[PDB]
Amino acid sequence: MRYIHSEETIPVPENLKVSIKSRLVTVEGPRGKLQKDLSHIAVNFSVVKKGVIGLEIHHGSRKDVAALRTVRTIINNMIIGVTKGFKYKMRYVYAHFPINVNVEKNAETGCYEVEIRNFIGEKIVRKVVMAPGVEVEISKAQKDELILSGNSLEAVSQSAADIQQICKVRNKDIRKFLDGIYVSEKGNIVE
């Protein structure tokens, strides 16, 4: 069973410009520029109206049609990021040993670096370097927060997961030892 016509649409607000060439999407707006390569998917791009982008697949199978909605939301994420940005929050969870962090500034390049000390009273100093375009801050709103912000959802989220995955307890019951750093909220910079 092959479906003749499957179609989706993406609206575009009257603030930014988008251009597609050889299945390479470039989105540019007030807060910067992003690029994505979609040469691995057979999709037909078109201009439906004055401010609407259309995409469709012809004679596709059930498995092939599945990727059509995946592509639509990825491009929509790019539009959101260039006009509203993204913002993640993290919290410290400890029982006895306080956790100390040091978000030192740019290390002669655009990358930020985060140092974590005194995890469950260990002598390791463990270091993680963020992806370019991501800025890490120590919150002043209230205690024990790390705030990550940027333009692209993929880079901000993966870097946040890097911090969470590095603080792990080994050879212990993890239902009792809840030590670590966890993400708690996802949202945009504006509003």
Partner 1 sequence: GRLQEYQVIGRHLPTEANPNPALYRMRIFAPNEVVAKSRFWYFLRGLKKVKKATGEIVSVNVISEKHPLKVKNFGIWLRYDSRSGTHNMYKEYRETSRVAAVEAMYADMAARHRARFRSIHILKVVELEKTEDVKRPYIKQLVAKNLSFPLPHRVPKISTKKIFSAKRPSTFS
Partner 2 sequence: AEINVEATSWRRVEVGRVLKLENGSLAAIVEIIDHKRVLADGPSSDPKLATPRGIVPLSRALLTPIVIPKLPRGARTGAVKKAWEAYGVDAKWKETNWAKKQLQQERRQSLTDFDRFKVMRLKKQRRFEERKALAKIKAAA
129 binds, among RNA, partner 2, partner 1, none (CB under 5 to 8 A by kind): none
Nearer to partner 1, 42 or 129 (CB): 42
Q: How far apart are CB 42 and RNA at their closest, in Å?
A: 4
CB of 143 to RNA, least distance (A): 50
Q: What is the C-alpha to C-alpha distance for residues 25 and 75, in angstroms, rounded to an integer?
A: 8
Tell me the two tokens of residue 50.
């004055």
Instruction: Identify the residue among 9, 35, 44, 102 touching partner 1 (CB under 8 A).
Output: 44
Cβ proximity to partner 2: between 83 and 149 the closer is 83
CA proximity to 39, closest of 57, 52, 28, 25: 25
CA distance 117 to 102: 8
Long-range contacts at 19-23 (CB < 8 A, ≥ 24 apart):
20/45
* Least distance from partner 1 to the Cβ atom of residue 4, Å: 6
Instruction: Return the one option of partner 2, partner 1, RNA, none that residue 60 interacts with (CB less than 5 to 8 A, by type).
Output: RNA
Q: Which is nearer to partner 1, 58 or 127 (CB)?
A: 58
Judged by beta carbon distances under 5 to 8 A according to partner kind, the member of partner 1, partner 2, RNA, none in contact with residue 17 is: partner 2
Distance CA 66, CA 2 (A): 12
| 22 DSSP 8-state letter | T
Cα dihedral 21→25→30→31 (10° resolution): -140
> Least CB distance from residue 103 to partner 2, whole Å?
38
